[PDB]
Design a protein around this ligand. Structure first.
Ligand code: OR1
Lengths: 99, 99
């Protein structure tokens, strides 16, 4: 669909069989989700934004459904105040910015 | 234009008569700019991000040109690592997400 930016671009995602709200965020290089249980081996990582950094866990080749579009890629899990779908998965579902 | 997300969506903006690099960021409610000399009245304000909060200077009705399209709205200046153009101005240049 076509998403306007008058409100926050919140969408429904499906990950590990659970449904959640996430923000589609062109300013995020990677996808970061509120704390959750994910399968697989994982590596530590720090992501930085306004105000500093947070320590997160990097899971690889994770399946995630974003408004019906399937994606499989890196998903970070950590103390983010908001679920963010970043450019690594936005490119997979074919998303572009247009003005 | 149509902007893909394989790389960071960096664009050139014109503000206060100066040209700068900024990130188009659908994940940001507001526009936050690197520390810079801008004339006019401003009010102090606190904004929150992924790593915590920062004190910023809130300028109101500041004119800003982004790839030729004009926008006027609130512009915060503060210790952000990167210039971010938020939804407050993205909507004015008529920007949307499409997948
Ligand atoms: C996730 C990730 C992984 C790997 C690399 C990077 C850079 C990543 O992105 C991190 C990241 O913070 N990006 C941001 C942009 C950026 C990029 C580079 C360095 C600094 C900031 C942004 O786009 C997402 C952020 C999410 C959010 C945080 C707290 C509350 C609500 C939403 N919004 C944001 O702080 O907005 C500000 C401004 O306006 C206000 O509205 C709402 C919040 C206020």
């Amino acid at each position: 669909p076509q998403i306007t930016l008058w409100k926050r671009p919140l969408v429904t995602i499906k990950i590990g069989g659970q449904l959640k709200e996430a923000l589609l965020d062109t300013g995020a290089d990677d996808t970061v989700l509120e704390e959750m249980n994910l399968p697989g081996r994982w590596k530590p990582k720090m992501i930085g934004g306004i105000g500093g950094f947070i320590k997160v866990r990097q899971y690889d080749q994770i399946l995630i459904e974003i408004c019906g579009h399937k994606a499989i890629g890196t998903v970070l899990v950590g103390p983010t105040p908001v679920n963010i779908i970043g450019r690594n998965l936005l490119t997979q579902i074919g998303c572009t910015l247009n003005f």
